[PDB]
Amino acid sequence: VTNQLQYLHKVVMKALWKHQFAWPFRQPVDAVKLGLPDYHKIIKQPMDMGTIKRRLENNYYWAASECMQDFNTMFTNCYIYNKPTDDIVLMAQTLEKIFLQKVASMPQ
Amino acid sequence: TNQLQYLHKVVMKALWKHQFAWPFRQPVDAVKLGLPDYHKIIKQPMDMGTIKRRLENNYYWAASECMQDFNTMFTNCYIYNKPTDDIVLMAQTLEKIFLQKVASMPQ
Ligand SMILES: O=c1nc(Nc2cccc(Cl)c2)oc2cc(Cl)oc(=O)c12
Numbered sequence: 001v002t003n004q005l006q007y008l009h010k011v012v013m014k015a016l017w018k019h020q021f022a023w024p025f026r027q028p029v030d031a032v033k034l035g036l037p038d039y040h041k042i043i044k045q046p047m048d049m050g051t052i053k054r055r056l057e058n059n060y061y062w063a064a065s066e067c068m069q070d071f072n073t074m075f076t077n078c079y080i081y082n083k084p085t086d087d088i089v090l091m092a093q094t095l096e097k098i099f100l101q102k103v104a105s106m107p108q
Numbered sequence: 109t110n111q112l113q114y115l116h117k118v119v120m121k122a123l124w125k126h127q128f129a130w131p132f133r134q135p136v137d138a139v140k141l142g143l144p145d146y147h148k149i150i151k152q153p154m155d156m157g158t159i160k161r162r163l164e165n166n167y168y169w170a171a172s173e174c175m176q177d178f179n180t181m182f183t184n185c186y187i188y189n190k191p192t193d194d195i196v197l198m199a200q201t202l203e204k205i206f207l208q209k210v211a212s213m214p215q
Contacts, residue, residue: 004211042191043173063211064211065207065208065211068207068210069204069207071204072204072207075185076182076200076203077187079183079187080186080196081191084149084187084188084202088185093183094180096179096183098175099180100172100175100176100179101172102113103175103210103211103212104170104172104175104213105215106211106213106215107215108212108215
């Protein structure tokens with residue numbers, strides 16, 4: 001495992017997975033349970049922290065930028081699909097600032 | 109610093125000359141663009157021109173500050189615009205370059 005994927009796993013994933021705002025992102029958006037039959041029509045590449053966490057556990061990624069895109073897609077889906085005033089956008093914004101903070105200090 | 113210098117000369121240069129960068133090079137003009145509700149939804153406007161000026165006048169203290177500004181620019185676009193607007197796609201494309209370039213920032 002590269003230095004960077006190790007960093008994304010041990011520093012970034014560790015910080016975001018246990019955050020108090022993380023629960024809505026720990027598993028794929030359930031459009032039935034959440035009652036949103038337009039979600040999969042708007043968001044065509046769903047993404048979530050469980051998938052990224054699993055992929056980091058199973059050495060699915062070949063480069064750090066690959067794991068970094070997944071994080072970006074997860075956040076960007078939220079800002080694209082949700083109303084500007086939904087609390088989830090603000091939770092997503094808080095997590096993403098931590099993501100960016102951490103990645104500013106990723107090795108190499 | 110070395111991280112701020114990299115964001116200026118590697119990251120910002122690549123993003124600035126891109127064929128999709130032109131809507132992001134200067135602040136959104138809600139008058140000239142007919143968007144009288146832009147500033148009611150978007151309370152912190154941001155744009156590459158601002159970020160570049162700040163890089164040049166030593167406004168930033170740490171790299172993460174400047175990257176935070178990049179993100180706000182992209183997020184404002186996703187939040188304000190309809191999912192189907194071409195500008196969302198131009199944002200995502202530029203944002204992938206940003207993330208790629210940021211992954212190779214010297215620590
Ligand atoms: O991305 C999203 N993920 C979730 N997850 C979620 C929400 C409540 C419980 C559980 Cl266990 C998971 O909630 C959302 C709600 C809405 Cl309206 O839009 C969204 O885009 C998202």
